Amino acid sequence: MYDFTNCDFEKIKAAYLSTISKDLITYMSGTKSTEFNNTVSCSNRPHCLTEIQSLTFNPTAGCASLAKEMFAMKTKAALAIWCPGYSETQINTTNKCLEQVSQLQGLWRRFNRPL
Amino acid sequence: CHWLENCWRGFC
Numbered sequence: 001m002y003d004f005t006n007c008d009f010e011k012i013k014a015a016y017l018s019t020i021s022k023d024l025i026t027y028m029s030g031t032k033s034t035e036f037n038n039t040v041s042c043s044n045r046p047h048c049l050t051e052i053q054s055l056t057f058n059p060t061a062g063c064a065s066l067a068k069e070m071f072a073m074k075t076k077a078a079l080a081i082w083c084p085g086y087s088e089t090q091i092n093t094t095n096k097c098l099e100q101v102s103q104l105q106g107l108w109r110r111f112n113r114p115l
Numbered sequence: 116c117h118w119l120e121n122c123w124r125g126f127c
């Protein structure tokens with residue numbers, strides 16, 4: 001569905017670095033990224049947001065939902081504010097949660113990459 | 116104003 005091509009990418013990066021990043025780090029609770037060899041890549045800013053959306057908010061076989069976590073709640077708010085039309089689209093097991101959050105941190109690093 | 120569910124209000 002939603003196409004992140006019209007978002008204010010710079011504002012979303014400022015929001016991530018200001019407040020979301022520290023919450024993913026807190027969630028990871030000392031587990032390091034080298035515990036997980038499989039990573040998820042992305043190719044440009046909207047594609048990164050698409051994958052960020054999917055890993056943050058979609059249930060998976062190994063991680064039922066992260067939607068109530070602080071980093072997720074803050075992600076949702078950032079997308080609601082800075083992606084035109086995003087909020088309209090939102091009106092309607094834990095064994096892989098750390099792996100998933102570690103993958104999210106990598107997707108955000110690529111989102112945040114200097115141009 | 117409609118606040119979304121599970122959505123932080125701190126950017127305001």
Ligand SMILES: *CCC(=O)N1CN(C(=O)CC*)CN(C(=O)CC*)C1
Nearest residue numbers: 077080116117118119122123126127
């Ligand atoms: C009343 C709702 C509102 O002001 N907005 C929708 N929204 C969210 O619901 C975030 C969870 C994003 N907005 C803001 O965050 C303003 C602080 C705008």
